[PDB]
Structure 1
Amino acid sequence: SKLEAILSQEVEAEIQALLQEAEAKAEAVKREAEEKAKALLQARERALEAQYRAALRRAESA
């Protein structure tokens, strides 16, 4: 009834705070998980670019 609903609503407020801490926990994982993915992609294209510049200076000196 309404009385059990108010009680399970207090417990649902605890549960909602529990989902909010779990959701911000998953977010605090995956924001920087996405950003380490992009940091990998950045450093990878930069290492390839270094190899490209070495290739061009070597071919033109040959």
Structure 2
Amino acid sequence: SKLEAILSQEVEAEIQALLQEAEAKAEAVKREAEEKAKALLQARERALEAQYRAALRRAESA
């Protein structure tokens, strides 16, 4: 029947959305990780470097 043609096209459009939606949210997740790590690796070097320059200073002052 004409009934199942419409049903086909319908169910399938949901199929396409599960997978695609999932990927884009995976990218968004991905993009979260990527930034978090980059900003962290910059930041934990930063603090150490300051504690270095200021450190040699404390030696020199000794």
Q: TM-score, normalised by structure 1?
A: 0.72
1:12 equivalent in structure 2: 12
Distance 1:2 1:48 in 2: 71
Distance 1:21 1:27 in 2: 10
Deviations 1:10-38 (A, max 9, x none): 64443122211100011101112111011
* Runs of 5+ consecutive residues of structure 2 not aligned to the other structure: none
Q: In percent, how many aligned pairs have the same letter?
A: 100
Distance 1:25 1:48 in 2: 35
Q: TM-score, normalised by structure 2?
A: 0.72
Instruction: Please tell me the root mean square deviation across aligned C-alpha atoms, in Å.
Output: 3.0
Which consecutive aligned stretches of 4+ in structure 1 deviate over 2 angstroms post-superposition? 1-14
TM-fit CA distance, 1:2: 15
Distance 2:4 2:56 in 1: 76
Distance 2:35 2:28 in 1: 11
TM-fit CA distance, 1:53: 1.1
